[PDB]
């Protein structure tokens, strides 16, 4: 059991290591309410967050709108931005490589 | 002017550096830089490693 535990954690780390580090996502998110039809129990569980993300050219940035779950973001009291990613105060967030099951 | 948790923001940091750790540099708003930034990468030693 101890060997299986260490083997699964080691293989997990090896799978995630050669992947995107998502350093540009630790920015400030302009999150608003999702404008679609939301059921009674989903109100406030999904936010429409706009940020300025980097692109290939170092000096060019694009405005990106994405839907984040409320559990993935934490409020803050900046004047111009409302939320940040929950893990940006603790660690870098590695994206799992796409086309990996 | 140090970076912080969020790429958007920065922070004004004050610290005491030894003269041997800094080198004179010429700029409009600054006087010194770290001695090794001119030649090599600086890695902070982990505080948990004795």
């Amino acid at each position, epitope marked *: 059991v101890e060997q299986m535990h260490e083997d699964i954690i080691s293989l997990w780390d090896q799978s995630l290591k050669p992947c995107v580090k998502l350093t540009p996502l630790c*920015v400030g998110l*302009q999150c608003t309410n999702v404008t679609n039809n939301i059921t009674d129990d989903m109100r406030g569980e999904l936010k429409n967050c706009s940020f*300025n993300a980097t692109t290939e050219l*170092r*000096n060019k*940035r694009q405005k990106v709108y994405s839907l984040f779950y409320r559990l993935d973001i934490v409020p*803050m*009291v*900046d*004047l*111009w931005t409302n939320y940040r990613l929950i893990s940006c105060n603790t660690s870098a967030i590695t994206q799992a490589c796409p086309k990996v099951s | *002017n140090a*970076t*912080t948790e969020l*790429r*958007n*923001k*920065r*922070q*004004k940091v004050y610290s005491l550096f030894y003269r041997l750790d800094i080198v004179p540099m010429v700029d409009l708003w600054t006087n010194y830089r770290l001695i090794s930034c001119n030649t090599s990468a600086i890695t902070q030693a982990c505080p948990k490693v004795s």
Partner: antibody
Amino acid sequence: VEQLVESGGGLVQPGASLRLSCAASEFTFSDSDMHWVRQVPGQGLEWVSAISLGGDTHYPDSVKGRFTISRDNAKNSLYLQMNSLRPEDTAVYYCARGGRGGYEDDYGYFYFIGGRRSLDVWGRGALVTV
Amino acid sequence: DIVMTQTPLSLPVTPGEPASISCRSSQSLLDSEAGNTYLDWYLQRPGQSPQLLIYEVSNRASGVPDRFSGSGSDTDFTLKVSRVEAEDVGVYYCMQGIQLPYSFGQGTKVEIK
């Protein structure tokens, strides 16, 4: 000193539009937030709008959809385009400076942790009467 | 939104006695991560109407004399002045600095007693 001068205004009819502006003075319109504030002749101070370093704007519920603010930066002036004015909107309007940042390509326009958020660099104000 | 409530609406003060002007924010103004509480006092005069007076707690704006130094916490905060001078008579305003609405409270008009 660091002090801007408002220019523009006049007497208009309901439904008219206006382009009110504040000029830059002593680099207060470079790396800084900007605010528009209303002084009602007989009531207290009311905030009208604010614009960030990156061109984000914010208005209160009574203003959204009527007033627009912008910055061009190349010509060192702040603009307020007023539309759909009402008699209740007769007041003295003026600019204020917010917090300050900087512009390095690590990430365009950055704020300070614990930086300034007060309204400073107050002008004289333009009178808008409907 | 944040509602800023000014306690006095009128306060005649004799120039030879101290005065206290206070207000309260409906929400806490403390930025826990930064540690700074964002509150501002403004003083309106018949001449130059807008003017910054006090920034946060016990941090005087440039040009403001020591007699205007205030105190308070993250909700209820106050200015206490030992003597009101002729140049100091005007309308005081409270502002919150943590949300973009920047709500202002009612003004306190100082009178000669």
